[model samples]
Target chain A: PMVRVATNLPDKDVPANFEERLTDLLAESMNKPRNRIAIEVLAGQRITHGASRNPVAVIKVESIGALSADDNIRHTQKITQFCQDTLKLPKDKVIITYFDLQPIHVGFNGTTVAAATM
Target chain B: PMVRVATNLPDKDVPANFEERLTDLLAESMNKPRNRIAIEVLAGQRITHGASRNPVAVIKVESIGALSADDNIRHTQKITQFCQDTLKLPKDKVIITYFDLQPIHVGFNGTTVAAATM
Candidate 1:
């Protein structure tokens, strides 16, 4: 339903258009449109990938029945690559997790996706 | 593998023991020990639920094959109640999503959980 991208990068490190660019990338990768997709990009989080203080990123994508095991595998690959290419973060520093929700669990516009769609 | 609790509450709005209590709640609920549970509580998030500016919470629990649909439903109920009582947020404003990762997809301690466990 949404993409939450948390990074340890600083404000100056993030580009002005980073949100828009990431929105597009996620929409394309998640097979959703600009309107349906919600994204949060937070920089300067106090986090670590391991013992190192280097830049690290954790991307969480949650949706209502929008992904499967194979779909998530593909997403992890592309999103991790995107983090590396766009943010200058290394592959090992990026982690992506995909959450597939049941329809009743996701709400939009004051109603569950299941109810709103029906 | 981890719990990411993002909230629209301010820093002062969250109690000092919020993370500790939540960590215990999730560990008990998910059947994961405290050490194996990675919990992140982020306050002051810019998020909305059903067009409301009231405090909202999004809890993302990701683990390797540790939850099912029914388990997620059960978690949603308890976590929502916890947010309501502890954070003073309403049930409708708290959304919990569970991500059941395949063992191969989750990496821990410089190796995939699958490889490390084996």
Candidate 2:
């Protein structure tokens, strides 16, 4: 099973090299090997008004049964500080979420099989 | 949400153009408008002698919130028969499976957000 991780901070307040630096820190901290990791990104194109009045950024991570929640949370904290230190963003701007996952090896139709040999 | 589909048939009995023909048939039967579909194939490289003496073929499909089970099942049958008629494969040669899915729009580290403008 793969696990999903999410990170977020208010948009428009992101630092330079935000994606690269964060991914590097998490991968290293969790002892996750390179090549075993895959990255997906979703950028903010819209915004919603909320209380506490700060822009936010979010990041998520997904991988096969490899790392733990504590490991992930620690990584998030490191990443958040990295952003704040390097980008000068507010410390409260980022959020991270995670979940376990499985890739569907099967397709939309059950009972369908591939032709193994020609 | 995306869906996963799997189709299988015993090895050594696949017809020519197996990939193309089957993908075409499924896309057509599901009314999938072609571009909205993606097909994946897993071929057998080894065999275990623990079955009822039959070769099986498997086919899988994955796509965003689009098709349904009944629609998918019917399409599987159509593709199977099309193989039987055109490729001369046995009726019992095919197997299909499906499941609901979602995309992982996140990366490994939480709290990391992309720098939109930079």
Question: DockQ of each candidate's interface versus the true one?
Answer: 0.09, 0.03
Model 2: per-residue Cα lDDT over B66-97, one tens digit each: 45767776766786787567546577665555
TM-score of decoy 1: 0.59
lDDT of each: 0.71, 0.44
Error of 2 at B33 (Å): 3.4
Give the range where candidate 2 chain B is weakest over 10 consecutive residues by summed lDDT. B108-117
Q: Give the residue spans of candidate 1 off by over 4 A.
A: A3-61, A65-100, A104-118
Query: Model 2 scores what on Cα lDDT?
Result: 0.44
Scoring the B chain of model 2 against the true B chain gives a TM-score of 0.55
Task: Estimate, for each residue in B33-106, the C-alpha lDDT of model 1 and write its tens digit.
Answer: 88888878888865543334457777777877546655555566667777777889865666666666788898
List clashing residue pairs in candidate 1.
A1-A62, A1-A63, B1-B62, B1-B63
Model 2 bad stretches (over 4 Å): A1-118, B1-16, B42-44, B47-50, B103-118
